[PDB]
Amino acid sequence: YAIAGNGVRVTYDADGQTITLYRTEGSGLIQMSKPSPLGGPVVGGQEVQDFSHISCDVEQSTSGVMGSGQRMTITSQSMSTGLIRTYVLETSDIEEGVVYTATSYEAGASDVEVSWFIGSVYELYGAEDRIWSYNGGGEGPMHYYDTLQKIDLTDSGKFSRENKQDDTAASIPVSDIYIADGGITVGDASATRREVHTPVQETSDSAQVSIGWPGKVIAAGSVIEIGESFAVVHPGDYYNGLRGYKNAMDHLGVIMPAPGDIPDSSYDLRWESWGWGFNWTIDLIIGKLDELQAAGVKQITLDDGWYTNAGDWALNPEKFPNGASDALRLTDAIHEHGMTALLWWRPCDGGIDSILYQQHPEYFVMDADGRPARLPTPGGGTNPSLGYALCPMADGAIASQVDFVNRAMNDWGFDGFKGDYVWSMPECYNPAHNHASPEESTEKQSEIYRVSYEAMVANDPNVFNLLCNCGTPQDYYSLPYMTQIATADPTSVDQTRRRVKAYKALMGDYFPVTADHNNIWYLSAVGTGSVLIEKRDLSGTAKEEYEKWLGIADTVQLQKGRFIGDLYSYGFDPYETYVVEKDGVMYYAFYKDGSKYSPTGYPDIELKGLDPNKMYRIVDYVNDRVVATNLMGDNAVFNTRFSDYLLVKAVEISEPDP
């Protein structure tokens, strides 16, 4: 009982009721998971472990969700509860290493109450001393939980992490665990948001990844579908798993922006207005335009403090005493100096003391007790800055968002918007809205994002749209309507670099991604291929450094290059590495300041991805020095010592150097 579509091989054992996963390399296969159970519901606080195999049927040539492939069905029966389980696994020929899972439950005797459903449990095989994991998250601590974590296998303790997707958690519903040989990625398969758990558990000698959904009462004689999930068995690191997941979900209607439709203003260097904090004035920004124009900045954004209240989105009289005239003047100055203008924005907010709530209570979300609800911070808390949420199924909220977009784009003059400081939508209990379920409000933020982006596009084909789910991984269902992605206020440099790699995997090689500006890491911004942006009012030696690195970024242009991340593996390679291709010439970035993963000694450096039949000269462009020469593409090994970083490029040479 086995199927194998492309790059995978799933086998089922009738006697033990276990599933084993493989991955194809060369002409053979590599084991990637030890035998694992199928999974079942949680009845009475304990998972049912009385399921008995009935029959298994395998179909060799079927068409399914992702196209042509294979499918086999497993039917099991439980005597204690009377439930009947049907398990369906699907693979496709075109897609490499993706498995589709579907579950259905039927109650034949009497009512069965289920508190949680469990499927697709897989345990890693071949682990030796450590396992690196990717966590979709959504509920973790805001600014201090890395999206990539290490599971040490020599520790006394154990590592467990439950990545939730609920009313207080909105992020990518994907988790991945990998070792040097490869890894396994499990993620949701749904075109719209729902409730899904992606736990990562450390076992006695390995780690586990799983999928889970909430349950409800199953009536007698009724068939209910629980959920669906995607399993990715890949070689390498989380980049391959995320890329496979994106390719798989491209078949469910979730399609990311194409490289030929991203506006050219997305790649331009940007300067935030955080230099003076909340005490900024129009005159200061106007007077700071000449220096940035000389340096090479081609984008200016307006941050917090310009509005009176959220929802109303009226101009603050303190910052704009003359009204729309001042905004037009600032926009005209920015345009005259050859730059575009953006605006700060909190999409789903509606305020607490705003006129929108004072005059129109009926567009907001109602709690269980009959009171307005507030936007939740990750975990379930409340921040004073955040206000009441706006129900997506009320026409007033959509009308207000469109009105604000049109007013900003046609009256004041602005070429884009910056979404910030919002995470999730609470449940609504208002009977007037006629909600089918209280969760209907939580599953429809994509409607607000889509409507706002449609208005923006209708006003101008080339627009800037970025959302900051600051602290946590960004909402997956807001991705199709963006043009740039940030790293959501990373705390350390390793965080922003790893998140840049992950978002390149999810989005695409050419998608604009920035490395944020919380701390000065120009090296990591340039080396990873991100967009260099700044917030401060710099003067002196740091000002000279800022201009120098702006010039380097302008003369290299790695933000418009192609990102390659499948060659090397993170956590099982001598250095933390990132590869960018620009006009044929390959660029490399090696790092050592990644406190999470830094090596001892000075290991040799191997450049892979080069033509074997070509001779290359390796020259650093930061200092204009030839580190190595006469290096054939096959060997491509040279020994060098550096403190923190090493940025190099492979310049082709027709004849050997002297």
Residue numbers in the entry: 44 to 701
From the paper:
Recent studies identified two synergistic enzymes from Flavonifractor plautii, namely, N-acetylgalactosamine deacetylase (FpGalNAcDeAc) and galactosaminidase (FpGalNase), which efficiently convert A-type RBCs to O-type by removing A antigens. In this study, we investigated two enzymes from Flavonifractor plautii, N-acetylgalactosamine deacetylase (FpGalNAcDeAc) and galactosaminidase (FpGalNase), which demonstrate synergistic activity in efficiently converting A-type RBCs to O-type. O-type RBCs lack immunodominant sugars found in A (α-N-acetylgalactosamine) and B antigen (galactose), making them essential in emergencies and when matching blood types is not feasible. One promising solution is the enzymatic conversion of all red blood cell (RBC) types into universal O-type RBCs.
We successfully determined the cryo-electron microscopy (cryo-EM) structure of full-length FpGalNase at 2.56 Å resolution. The N-terminal region (residue 27–699) adopts a disc-like conformation divided into three segments: the N-domain, the central GH36 domain, and the C-domain. Structural similarity analysis using the Dali tool revealed that each domain exhibits a structure similar to α-galactosidase, despite low sequence identity. Conserved residues in FpGalNase active site include W317, D346, D347, W387, K461, and D463 (patch A), along with specific non-conserved residues (Y464, C513, and D532) in patch B, which afford a more open catalytic center conformation and may determine its substrate specificity. Site-directed mutagenesis of D463A, Y464A, C513A, and D532A confirmed the functional importance of these residues, as mutations led to significant reductions in conversion activity, with D463A, C513A, and D532A nearly inactive, and the mutants were unable to convert A-type RBCs to O-type in samples from healthy donors. Moreover, comparison between the experimental structure and the AlphaFold-predicted structure revealed a significant deviation in the region from D559 to W564 in the catalytic pocket, highlighting the critical role of experimental data in refining structural models. Sequencing analysis of FpGalNAcDeAc and FpGalNase revealed three mutations in each protein, including V284A in FpGalNAcDeAc and P566L in FpGalNase, located within their catalytic domains. The resolved structures of FpGalNase revealed unique active centers.
